């Protein structure tokens, strides 16, 4: 069911199916279905349409999620555009933000190795 921006997860437990949304994770998941009052271990296969409506209405509202909060997150990094701080430059150069070790490692932001040789 097209809950937020997504619909994908069929026969696979609503507490888990919920996770498949940028903004839900695991904590907001069971938090949303206990506050909506729905059984977590259900089929996800389009069960009681009412439960699905209530779920959708609560989840999609309340807190920001999916493409909207991706925009906000990207905009929070755009904050350090202008004449920003040190943390912005780390987002500029493509290097790790939290001042860690970059002599080795840091491949998750630098990307795969390039090898200079000399």
């Amino acid at each position: 069911a097209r809950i937020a921006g997504v619909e994908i997860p069929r026969n696979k437990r609503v507490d888990v199916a919920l996770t498949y949304i940028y903004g839900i994770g695991k904590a907001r998941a069971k938090e949303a279905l206990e506050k909506t009052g729905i059984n977590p271990a259900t089929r996800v296969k389009d069960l009681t349409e009412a439960e699905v409506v209530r779920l959708r209405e609560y989840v999609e509202n309340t807190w920001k999620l999916e493409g909207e909060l991706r925009a906000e997150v990207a905009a929070n990094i755009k904050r350090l555009m202008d004449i920003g701080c040190y943390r912005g430059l780390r987002h500029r150069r493509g290097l790790p933000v939290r001042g860690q070790r970059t002599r080795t490692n840091a491949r998750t932001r630098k990307g795969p190795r390039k090898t200079v040789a000399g």
Partner: protein, 82 residues
């Protein structure tokens, strides 16, 4: 990350506040990021020390929890052969 303290340098503020009544001149230095962005005197320039010299940083809202020296990189890097 402080919560009940949330401090700024007393000496930075002394110089900053007694030069805040009805206006001033942007000629104001420091020697400590340690402080915090300080609201009021936003339209100001604080020459922060980066270990070598005093870099004129400018305040235009937008900044807060970022004290000073984040606006004063201490290294240079610039490039690695390329």
């Amino acid at each position: 990350s402080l919560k009940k303290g949330v401090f700024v340098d007393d000496h930075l503020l002394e110089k900053v506040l007694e030069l805040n009544a009805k206006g001033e001149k942007r000629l104001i230095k420091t020697w400590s990021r340690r402080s915090t962005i300080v609201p009021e005197m936003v339209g100001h320039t604080i020459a922060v020390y980066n270990g070598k010299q005093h870099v004129p940083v400018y305040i235009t809202e937008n900044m807060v929890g970022h004290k000073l020296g984040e606006f004063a990189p201490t290294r240079t890097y610039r490039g690695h052969g390329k």
